[PDB]
Amino acid sequence: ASRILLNNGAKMPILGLGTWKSPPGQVTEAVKVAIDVGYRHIDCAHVYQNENEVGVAIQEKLREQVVKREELFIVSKLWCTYHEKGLVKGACQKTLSDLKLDYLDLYLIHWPTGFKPGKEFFPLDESGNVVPSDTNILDTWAAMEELVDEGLVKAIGISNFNHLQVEMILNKPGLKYKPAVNQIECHPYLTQEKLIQYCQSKGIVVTAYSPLGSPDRPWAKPEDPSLLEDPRIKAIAAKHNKTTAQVLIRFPMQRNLVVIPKSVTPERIAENFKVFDFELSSQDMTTLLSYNRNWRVCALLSDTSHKDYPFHEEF
Numbered sequence: 001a002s003r004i005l006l007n008n009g010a011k012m013p014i015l016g017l018g019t020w021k022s023p024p025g026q027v028t029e030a031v032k033v034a035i036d037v038g039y040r041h042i043d044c045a046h047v048y049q050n051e052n053e054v055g056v057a058i059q060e061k062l063r064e065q066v067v068k069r070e071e072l073f074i075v076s077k078l079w080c081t082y083h084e085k086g087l088v089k090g091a092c093q094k095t096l097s098d099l100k101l102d103y104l105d106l107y108l109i110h111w112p113t114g115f116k117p118g119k120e121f122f123p124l125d126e127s128g129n130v131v132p133s134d135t136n137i138l139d140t141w142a143a144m145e146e147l148v149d150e151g152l153v154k155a156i157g158i159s160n161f162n163h164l165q166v167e168m169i170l171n172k173p174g175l176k177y178k179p180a181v182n183q184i185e186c187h188p189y190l191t192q193e194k195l196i197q198y199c200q201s202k203g204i205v206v207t208a209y210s211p212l213g214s215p216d217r218p219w220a221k222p223e224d225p226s227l228l229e230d231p232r233i234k235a236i237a238a239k240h241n242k243t244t245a246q247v248l249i250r251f252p253m254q255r256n257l258v259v260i261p262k263s264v265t266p267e268r269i270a271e272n273f274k275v276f277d278f279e280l281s282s283q284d285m286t287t288l289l290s291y292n293r294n295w296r297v298c299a300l301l302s303d304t305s306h307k308d309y310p311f312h313e314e315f
């Protein structure tokens with residue numbers, strides 16, 4: 001299928017467009033091209049500082065009668081500096097206003113960690129440590145629940161939560177909505193078998209981010225492993241007469257995951273969509289999973305001491 005069923009009864013397209021690091025100057029066109037070749041899910045975030053430009057793309061294609069809103073699946077994320085209960089609605093309404101939407105299909109707690117509230121997205125002390133806020137996961141969740149109850153969002157979830165932090169919400173006394181989705185880093189070098197096992201066994205859909213290894217991540221090192229340049233994957237792709245990326249995208253799809261590859265390059269936006277016309281074999285799958293090195297690209301070492309930092313646990 002092209003969409004997966006969420007616990008709120010809605011269907012989420014398994015392929016969406018990533019927008020982290022998509023420059024404002026270029027993401028409007030990115031989103032317009034994506035919608036034209038068939039993407040219906042867009043992954044956004046206030047912290048990406050481009051939601052206005054996404055918004056412009058979406059409104060235009062609506063008005064062009066290319067798509068209707070009910071066909072779109074728009075995701076955004078509550079940033080760490082807005083975890084306080086009194087800050088959540090405003091944060092959501094800023095995103096809705098930027099995107100020019102009257103609701104979000106899915107809204108996620110971006111990271112489990114709260115940061116000191118203020119203008120700066122990554123507030124630092126004088127020694128380079130990120131300054132936390134005195135917020136906890138459960139209170140933030142209750143604020144997320146309100147947004148559903150108020151019709152601002154159809155569904156809520158989490159992102160970058162380890163299985164203990166997921167359990168905390170699941171077991172929350174007086175829980176109103178279970179998380180629909182957990183959006184985590186996932187690719188052949190970080191295959192997340194245990195967390196995916198956990199999440200799926202709980203009826204929680206897993207979305208795979210940085211499926212191509214985020215080669216444009218601002219802290220990349222030349223010596224870092226590169227999925228897109230991996231000769232082993234290239235060979236699997238050539239066998240299927242597909243590109244390396246196409247394979248890297250088809251891989252999470254065959255694990256019953258949602259996947260959200262990012263591009264602002266029109267030809268790669270279309271390339272990345274052409275993944276519904278082939279299947280990776282059982283061996284292929286097995287082979288890609290064996291490349292796991294539990295290697296992640298998205299972490300924040302300056303925040304490792306946070307009580308809620310997620311990657312100290314095994315999964």
Ligand SMILES: NC(=O)c1ccc[n+]([C@@H]2O[C@H](COP(=O)([O-])OP(=O)(O)OC[C@H]3O[C@@H](n4cnc5c(N)ncnc54)[C@H](OP(=O)(O)O)[C@@H]3O)[C@@H](O)[C@H]2O)c1
Binds near residue numbers: 017264272
């Ligand atoms: N929840 C979170 O904490 C979190 C964290 C990280 C990412 N995510 C989400 O996941 C999305 C995807 O992850 P990502 O942006 O980190 O990286 P990604 O999708 O793994 O890779 C994006 C990089 O790959 C390039 N690229 C795209 N298609 C290509 C192709 N067919 N061939 C060769 N290169 C290609 C892009 O180049 P161009 O764009 O220049 O073409 C860009 O430099 C993000 O944009 C964001 O929406 C969520």
Ligand SMILES: O=C(O)Cn1ccc(=O)n(Cc2nc3cc(Cl)ccc3s2)c1=O
Binds near residue numbers: 047300309310
């Ligand atoms: O947030 C995004 O979607 C993209 N993104 C942007 C900047 C960046 O440094 N990172 C790494 C982070 N790691 C943590 C780790 C934790 Cl515990 C909290 C926040 C972050 S941010 C990043 O993933």
